[PDB]
Write an enzyme that holds these catalytic residues in place. Structure first.
Site, PDB file in Angstrom:
ATOM      1  N   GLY B  85       0.802  -1.212   0.000  1.00  0.00           N
ATOM      2  CA  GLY B  85       0.000   0.000   0.000  1.00  0.00           C
ATOM      3  C   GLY B  85       0.830   1.256   0.000  1.00  0.00           C
ATOM      4  O   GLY B  85       1.808   1.377  -0.749  1.00  0.00           O
ATOM      5  N   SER B 112      -5.046  -2.400   2.713  1.00  0.00           N
ATOM      6  CA  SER B 112      -4.558  -1.046   3.028  1.00  0.00           C
ATOM      7  C   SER B 112      -4.952  -0.041   1.898  1.00  0.00           C
ATOM      8  O   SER B 112      -6.096   0.039   1.445  1.00  0.00           O
ATOM      9  CB  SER B 112      -3.023  -1.169   3.252  1.00  0.00           C
ATOM     10  OG  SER B 112      -2.426   0.002   3.727  1.00  0.00           O
ATOM     11  N   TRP B 180      11.153  -7.069   9.644  1.00  0.00           N
ATOM     12  CA  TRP B 180      10.791  -6.604   8.338  1.00  0.00           C
ATOM     13  C   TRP B 180      11.717  -7.163   7.282  1.00  0.00           C
ATOM     14  O   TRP B 180      11.336  -8.046   6.569  1.00  0.00           O
ATOM     15  CB  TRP B 180      10.750  -5.100   8.279  1.00  0.00           C
ATOM     16  CG  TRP B 180      10.255  -4.609   7.022  1.00  0.00           C
ATOM     17  CD1 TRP B 180      10.942  -3.934   6.108  1.00  0.00           C
ATOM     18  CD2 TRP B 180       8.943  -4.754   6.511  1.00  0.00           C
ATOM     19  NE1 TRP B 180      10.153  -3.624   5.053  1.00  0.00           N
ATOM     20  CE2 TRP B 180       8.913  -4.137   5.278  1.00  0.00           C
ATOM     21  CE3 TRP B 180       7.787  -5.351   6.982  1.00  0.00           C
ATOM     22  CZ2 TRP B 180       7.785  -4.091   4.515  1.00  0.00           C
ATOM     23  CZ3 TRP B 180       6.681  -5.303   6.221  1.00  0.00           C
ATOM     24  CH2 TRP B 180       6.683  -4.690   5.006  1.00  0.00           C
ATOM     25  N   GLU B 235     -11.362  -1.440   8.682  1.00  0.00           N
ATOM     26  CA  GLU B 235     -10.084  -1.754   9.288  1.00  0.00           C
ATOM     27  C   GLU B 235      -9.233  -0.486   9.234  1.00  0.00           C
ATOM     28  O   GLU B 235      -9.229   0.198   8.220  1.00  0.00           O
ATOM     29  CB  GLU B 235      -9.524  -2.846   8.351  1.00  0.00           C
ATOM     30  CG  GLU B 235      -8.194  -3.314   8.459  1.00  0.00           C
ATOM     31  CD  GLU B 235      -7.112  -2.392   7.986  1.00  0.00           C
ATOM     32  OE1 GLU B 235      -6.801  -2.264   6.774  1.00  0.00           O
ATOM     33  OE2 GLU B 235      -6.486  -1.875   8.895  1.00  0.00           O
ATOM     34  N   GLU B 269      -3.553  -2.693  14.210  1.00  0.00           N
ATOM     35  CA  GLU B 269      -2.111  -2.797  14.355  1.00  0.00           C
ATOM     36  C   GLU B 269      -1.429  -1.559  15.012  1.00  0.00           C
ATOM     37  O   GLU B 269      -1.626  -0.429  14.571  1.00  0.00           O
ATOM     38  CB  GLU B 269      -1.500  -3.038  12.980  1.00  0.00           C
ATOM     39  CG  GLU B 269      -0.011  -3.336  13.001  1.00  0.00           C
ATOM     40  CD  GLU B 269       0.709  -2.884  11.739  1.00  0.00           C
ATOM     41  OE1 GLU B 269       0.263  -1.896  11.091  1.00  0.00           O
ATOM     42  OE2 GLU B 269       1.743  -3.520  11.433  1.00  0.00           O
ATOM     43  N   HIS B 303      -3.841  -5.350   9.061  1.00  0.00           N
ATOM     44  CA  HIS B 303      -2.408  -5.300   9.099  1.00  0.00           C
ATOM     45  C   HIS B 303      -1.770  -6.286  10.058  1.00  0.00           C
ATOM     46  O   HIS B 303      -0.608  -6.551   9.972  1.00  0.00           O
ATOM     47  CB  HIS B 303      -1.964  -3.904   9.445  1.00  0.00           C
ATOM     48  CG  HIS B 303      -1.609  -3.088   8.258  1.00  0.00           C
ATOM     49  ND1 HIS B 303      -2.496  -2.225   7.665  1.00  0.00           N
ATOM     50  CD2 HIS B 303      -0.456  -2.976   7.574  1.00  0.00           C
ATOM     51  CE1 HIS B 303      -1.910  -1.635   6.647  1.00  0.00           C
ATOM     52  NE2 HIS B 303      -0.675  -2.080   6.565  1.00  0.00           N
TER      53      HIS B 303
END
Lengths: 335, 333
Positions: B85, B112, B180, B235, B269, B303
């Site tokens: 996103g 997203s 990540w 969301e 999140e 997320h």
């Protein structure tokens, strides 16, 4: 067509303050006490809304508490002008609960900026009475000399003094968006030479509508958002955002047909803009979104978070000249 | 209401970057995501802006549109999936080849910011689209969570499913902001529940996705109109109390809650409660002002990991009190 308007401000008038969002009167007491003292010394009285001094973390209070605060000002015949203390995000929560009938039965000057756009535009949409994109007590009138005095000049020239029409909106000679001197002063902000930018040449005349673009996305589609009409002049401003965020807001207007309708655009300066490493100015990003569609555009207008601030009436006829960089108000906004 | 073909092993997933340039800034997660799917038996066809960089975005408005359009018109591609996103998918909406998509329906998936495109294609074509995995965030995740997200992705898109199709809650989730590009430790296994915030049942067509994003397309021809009886699915992720209050009130003043028969709210999140200790659903309840709408919250389609692949624009039955969600209408061939 004589179409109802609030009474001009007068010396000695009472200004009602309220906190529809951030609890600045608690978190920034010195700037708040200073802003009060500035206007009291000028001769006005301040009526402190019921949430003054109060703290609910990211807000001043519940939705109902904040509606109640504003409505009490609105219902008060002794109040001439209703001013937000600061913005934030959550003004749009109040909209279902505002006493619009009361306001329409006793119009007052409604003034503020940033998140207060929800309320400014909400009241104008429900009542048709023009409202004002202008000073909020703490950020605007809490500013140290010298800039405060220009903001004050504009505030008086537009709401107290009589003005023959067309009324010319003069470019301030200097500006700043330095992120210093909030509560305590530590050095003189630089007096930067000012200019507006003729991004796209042309002239437009029409009703001005807009405010803080980010806040508009919080009220779009609802009965609190005025419909943009064929020929309107779009006035938009954002502050302390980045390139991603504004691209989205510009495309949001684009996909809604706003740019097919408007005759001209006035874009405010962008306080502390984060270009994400692009080096692009906010008008360049907008121009990409406009694609091959040509629209007269005047940028870095001083009606935003930068200092000084101009007071702009909303919902009245303006003439913008993007080529010669002039803005005139063409119809009365007060009586 | 025409429908896309179910995914098959051997198919090609076409990927594109409608916003953030994650394939440039996050090359390890990207590579890992692509390898995970190749191993499962899918090919990846790489959008023309793959590897490009324009700071906050992949490329110009026109280039991003061309990147997605090339995929939409490629007959060899069965599924079109965003890499990630960001903020700027709404910019492409005027330039997308809706008619080619309509004449050859395929799986459109992501989450997203990609909500702008999921809803726009649905608004324009009536073809159901899917709130689910984006390549890099979703399939670049490390074990254990990526395997549960993959299980859900097969269940919705590849498996042959009978109606009604039951959407089950995972045992464990996480939203830990680590791992990540490279792993360092294991994410905390957080034990799951869905939240019976307001009791009730509702059946109706499911509309929504990322609420922040929706505010970037609201009122336009690319936003489907919310109808009487719709189930609202919303969301948000990595925002704060102030932000989601604004978005909730934005729904309220637009009359959304006068029309929807139920709400289904995702987990938030890394939510920032600004010190209030309030849950997003509590903020939403304030805005709702005691309007009796069945409300099931902490749904795992957002997320947080793992993620459900949820179809959009199809009849759904939710029971907030017994925490079930069933899809009642066919969403693929």
């Amino acid at each position: 067509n004589a179409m109802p308007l609030p009474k001009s401000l007068k010396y000695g008038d009472t200004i009602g303050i309220y906190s529809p969002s951030s609890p600045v009167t608690y978190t920034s007491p010195k700037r708040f006490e200073r802003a009060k003292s500035y206007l009291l010394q000028k001769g006005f009285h301040i009526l402190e809304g019921s949430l003054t001094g109060r703290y609910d973390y990211y807000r001043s209070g519940s939705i109902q508490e904040r509606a109640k605060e504003l409505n009490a000002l609105i219902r008060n015949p002794n109040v001439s002008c209703i001013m937000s203390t600061i913005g934030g995000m959550n003004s749009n929560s109040l909209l279902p609960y505002i006493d619009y009938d009361a306001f329409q039965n006793n119009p007052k000057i409604m003034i503020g900026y940033s998140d207060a756009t929800a309320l400014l535009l909400g009241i104008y949409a429900k009542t048709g009475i023009p409202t004002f994109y202008g000073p909020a007590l703490v950020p605007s009138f809490g500013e140290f000399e010298p800039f405060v005095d220009d903001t004050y000049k504009y505030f008086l020239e537009t709401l107290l003094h009589d003005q023959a029409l067309p009324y010319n909106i003069k470019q301030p000679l200097f500006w700043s968006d330095e992120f210093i001197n909030w509560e305590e002063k530590t050095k003189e902000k630089e007096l930067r030479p000012n200019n507006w930018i003729s991004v796209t040449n042309g002239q437009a005349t029409g009703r001005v509508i807009g405010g803080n673009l980010n806040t508009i996305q919080g009220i779009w589609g609802s009965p609190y958002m005025p419909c943009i009409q064929e020929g309107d002049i779009l006035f938009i401003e954002d502050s302390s955002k980045d390139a991603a965020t504004i691209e989205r807001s510009f495309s949001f207007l684009k996909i809604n047909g706003v740019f097919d309708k408007v005759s001209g655009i006035i874009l405010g300066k962008h306080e502390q803009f984060d270009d994400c490493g692009t080096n692009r100015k906010p008008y360049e990003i907008l121009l990409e979104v406009l694609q091959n569609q040509r629209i007269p555009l005047l940028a870095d207008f001083d009606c935003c978070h930068t200092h000084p601030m101009i007071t702009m009436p909303i919902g009245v006829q303006v003439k913008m000249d993007a080529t010669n960089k002039t803005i005139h108000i063409l119809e009365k906004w007060k009586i």
